[PDB]
Design a protein around this ligand. Structure first.
Ligand SMILES: O=C(O)CNC(=O)C(=O)O
Ligand SMILES: [Mg+2]
Ligand code: NI
Ligand SMILES: [Zn+2]
Length: 331
């Protein structure tokens, strides 16, 4: 069995190996990369996503989100308070202000210590989930707006044509912006490219151990768990590495830098934080190996999780018994 300790693997594809996206995902899996839940892909030195980032300031962040925490430093939830619209140039100036800028630090480990000690005492503002792309149309390799769609994969595997579309999203971050513990919608893959700026630290639980994280979360968030049998779908709960280690939960950590891709694998729980002003692009995707995970994915039906149009068909075809209850949650 490849990668039996479920370590995060780092890949360096050549320019020739960078041509065929599907083939390279399957290669990484042949080496056991999915057992970690997360892999890093460093593009060949010949590749670029676009020519420059000098002309992005006029992108609008229509609904910036202030991430307000409740709880204790290692075990907390966050809610998102909507703020007034601002441009990317306005948001960058805000991120660099004395109130929001990254503090002085020695290295990534010192900054990680400061994040976990202090995060709850501040409310950073995140530009998340903005439909769009920063890849140039002429970038032919690993262009996240030109991937094979999940609807086409379901049709190729199962024979059924379905409605829906699959497009990328932009994330503009600042110091202490946080992504809560989650797996993807329908336990899909994700791919994330860090276009510019400061790093992103990730934490991940191997897919084979995801239910250990779920049991801890039910213990640590007992009101939320009574409310919803899949409350981590709400994407609000944070648990620190120290707390995970105290409770024997298997996990790994890695820091992504500008110019790097990360891939999350089906049912790989992940969480993390941004080091300072940055911009990432991400999209969900599927492969043949996903179908079995999609059929078994948990679902939130309490009303909270509320998701895209395109998840309807995935539930309806892969999970027909759950469909009626899930759709009640959506309405
Ligand atoms: O970058 C973020 O805020 C969160 N990203 C993801 O969870 C992802 O790419 O799957
Ligand atoms: Mg612009
Ligand atoms: Ni994710
Ligand atoms: Zn729910």
């Amino acid at each position: 069995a490849q990668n039996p300790n479920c370590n995060i693997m780092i890949f360096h594809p050549t320019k020739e190996e960078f041509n065929d996206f599907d083939k390279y995902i399957a290669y990484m899996e042949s080496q056991g990369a999915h057992r970690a839940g997360l892999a890093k892909i460093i593009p060949p030195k010949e590749w670029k996503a676009r020519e420059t980032y000098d002309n992005i300031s006029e992108i609008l962040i229509a609904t910036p989100l202030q991430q307000v925490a409740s709880g204790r430093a290692g075990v907390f939830t966050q809610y998102h308070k909507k703020k007034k619209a601002m441009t990317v140039g306005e948001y960058r100036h805000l991120a660099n202000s004395k109130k929001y800028q990254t503090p002085p630090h020695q290295n990534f480990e010192d900054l990680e210590r400061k994040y976990w000690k202090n995060r709850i005492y501040n409310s950073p503002i995140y530009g998340a989930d903005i439909s769009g792309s920063l890849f140039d149309e002429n970038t032919k390799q690993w262009n996240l707006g030109h991937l094979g769609t999940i609807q086409d994969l379901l049709e190729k595997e199962c024979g059924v044509v379905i409605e829906g579309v699959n497009t990328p999203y932009l994330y503009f971050g600042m110091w202490k912006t946080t992504f809560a513990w989650h797996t993807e919608d329908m336990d899909l893959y994700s791919i994330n490219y860090l276009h510019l700026g400061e790093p992103k630290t990730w934490y991940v639980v191997p897919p084979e151990h995801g239910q250990r994280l779920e049991r801890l979360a039910r213990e640590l968030f007992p009101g939320s768990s009574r409310g919803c049998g899949a409350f981590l779908r709400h994407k609000v709960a944070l648990i620190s590495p120290t707390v995970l280690k105290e409770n024997g939960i298997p996990f790994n950590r890695i820091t992504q830098e500008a110019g790097e891709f990360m891939v999350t694998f089906p049912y790989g729980y992940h969480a993390g934080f941004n080091h300072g002003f940055n911009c990432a692009e991400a999209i969900n995707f599927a492969t043949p190996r996903w179908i079995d995970y999609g059929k078994m994915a948990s679902q939130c039906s309490c009303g909270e999780a509320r998701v895209t149009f395109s998840m309807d068909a995935f539930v309806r075809i892969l999970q027909p018994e759950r469909y009626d209850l899930w759709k009640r949650g959506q309405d």
